[PDB]
Design a protein around this ligand. Structure first.
Ligand SMILES: [Zn+2]
Ligand SMILES: [Zn+2]
Ligand SMILES: [Zn+2]
Ligand SMILES: [Zn+2]
Lengths: 95, 95, 95, 95
């Protein structure tokens, strides 16, 4: 089961998502919403294993046709890539 | 010990490298020469684990300050990347 | 939409799955069935990016709670790992 | 050029390595010594891209026939792997 935080709810109401009382979870765009932290943990984990760029994971994700609406996906995705030091090194290569 | 093929020798003489009789191996640019197949096997192996692009591995390599002159490096490097289907998929995500 | 082959249907009927006429796809264990080739292409693609072992991807997959029943998953998963030369090299390391 | 710290020198003298005045660097086992932090940064970077286990990187390294003696290699290598959360997750899949 999904567990949401105040921040999550704040972003969700601000996003225009609905909370399904009987269902235990929020919905947006006809999908169950994946919380921010869950989304981050997942995305971080994916980047660690592939170290794919922002543009690349994003396209791969949208193509993955996820059952879940990943809250703050792109924002979190950027943070992860932009702060990945491994990615930073493999791209700091000018002579 | 390094083992060279006819093709290797053909490219080496064409490259202007010298063969060190007493040393058992060819030299180019003051480095022992890494044969073509050895170079390929190595590079392929590296690409499989990182799936880094051509431009990226190349820069990483030149920065690695290898003890060996990798025969037909760039040519082989291109082939590997250009024919990597995993790389092909992660980049076929265009709209 | 999913496209199935004779082989797929042969394994599916042999598996005890049902084909949903109106739905266009086979179902097994309450999930839409992912064809063999689709499953393979996907799994191969995952292994290429992580090169995780059999035991590891399997557990990761079962934990992923997939919406789809991946046809011939374990059999295909084994083949991929057992024939991955990169995995073969990183593990051929005895002195 | 290599830059060494007090800690490095402390471990180096304790290791029995010599410092080559004219050469600017310490030597151990006939190799130029790679400082601790440099070794760590390098090893961390390698683990990020492959997430190979301790036993695996170690064997791969020894097989790499490095020109440099990597200071505190195994100790640092362990720390990196043992504290890698990605590795922790991919292996926390136990039942
Ligand atoms: Zn990265
Ligand atoms: Zn690739
Ligand atoms: Zn593999
Ligand atoms: Zn790791």
């Amino acid at each position: 089961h999904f567990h949401y935080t105040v921040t999550d709810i704040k972003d969700l109401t601000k996003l225009g998502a609905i909370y399904d009382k009987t269902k235990k979870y929020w919905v947006y765009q006809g999908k169950p919403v994946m919380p921010d932290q869950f989304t981050f943990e997942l995305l971080d984990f994916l980047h660690q294993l592939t170290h794919l760029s922002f543009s690349k994971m994003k396209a791969l994700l949208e193509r993955s046709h996820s059952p879940y609406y990943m809250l703050n996906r792109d924002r979190t995705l950027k943070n992860i890539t932009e702060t990945c030091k491994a990615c930073a090194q493999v791209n700091a290569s000018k002579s």
